[PDB]
C-alpha cells in the first residue's frame, strides 16, 4: 500500500535522532525488513501491513513534536498509549530478527560481509537494551562499517 509513508518518516526520525546523515544503506535495509515482516506471514499480511500504518502515523506525529532524544520519543509513545508503545517495540525487535533470519540476504542487499551483518544485529540488540531502538543502533553501526571499508 502507501506504507512507504512509514519508511519515509521512519528514516527521517531515525537519522535525526542518531546524529547521522541520511544513508542509502539504511533505507535499503529498512525496506528489506518491512518486506520481510510482510512475507513472514502471508496468512496475516494485511494485519502486519496495517500495524505499519498505525506506526507510520506515530512517527509522523513524532516529527511534529519537540523530540530531540530517544527518551523524548519514548515519552511521546507513552502519551500515545500502549498500542503504539508495543507497536514500535514489536517492529524494532523484528528488525533484529529479520537480520538474523536471513544474514546472507542482508549481506546481498547491502554488499557487506556476513561479519558486518552480525555487527548490525549486535548493534541493534544493544540499542534496544539502551532504550534507543534497533534502527538507531543499526544506523550508527552502518557508518562505522562504511568507514572501515570505504575510507
Question: Site residues (CB under 5 A) for Cl ion?
Answer: 11, 15, 22-23, 26
Q: Which of 98, 102, 90 is nearest to 128 (CA)?
A: 90
Q: Which is nearer to Cl ion, 31 or 49 (CB)?
A: 31
Q: How far is the CB of 139 from Cl ion (least distance, A)?
A: 7
Q: Which is nearer to Cl ion, 15 or 119 (CB)?
A: 15
Q: How far is the CB of 24 from Cl ion (least distance, A)?
A: 8
Q: Which is nearer to Cl ion, 94 or 135 (CB)?
A: 135
Q: How far is the CB of 138 from Cl ion (least distance, A)?
A: 10
Q: Which is nearer to Cl ion, 27 or 80 (CB)?
A: 27
Burial state string for 100-121 with b = 16 or more CB within 10 A and e = fewer than 16 = eeebeebbeebebeeebbebbb
Amino acid at each position: 500500500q502507501a506504507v512507504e509513508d512509514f519508511l519515509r518518516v521512519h528514516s527521517e526520525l531515525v537519522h535525526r535522532l542518531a546524529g547521522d546523515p541520511p544513508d542509502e544503506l539504511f533505507q535499503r535495509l529498512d525496506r528489506f525488513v518491512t518486506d520481510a515482516i510482510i512475507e513472514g506471514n502471508p496468512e496475516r499480511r494485511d494485519e502486519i501491513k496495517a500495524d505499519l500504518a498505525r506506526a507510520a502515523r506515530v512517527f509522523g506525529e513524532a516529527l511534529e513534536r519537540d523530540i530531540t532524544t530517544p527518551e523524548d520519543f519514548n515519552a511521546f509513545l507513552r502519551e500515545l498509549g500502549p498500542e503504539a508503545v508495543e507497536l514500535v517495540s514489536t517492529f524494532t525487535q523484528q528488525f533484529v530478527d529479520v537480520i538474523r533470519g536471513d544474514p546472507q540476504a542482508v549481506a546481498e542487499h547491502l554488499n557487506i560481509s556476513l561479519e558486518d551483518v552480525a555487527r548490525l544485529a549486535e548493534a541493534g540488540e544493544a540499542a534496544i537494551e539502551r532504550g534507543e531502538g534497533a534502527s538507531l543502533g543499526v544506523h550508527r553501526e552502518l557508518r562505522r562499517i562504511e568507514a572501515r571499508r570505504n575510507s
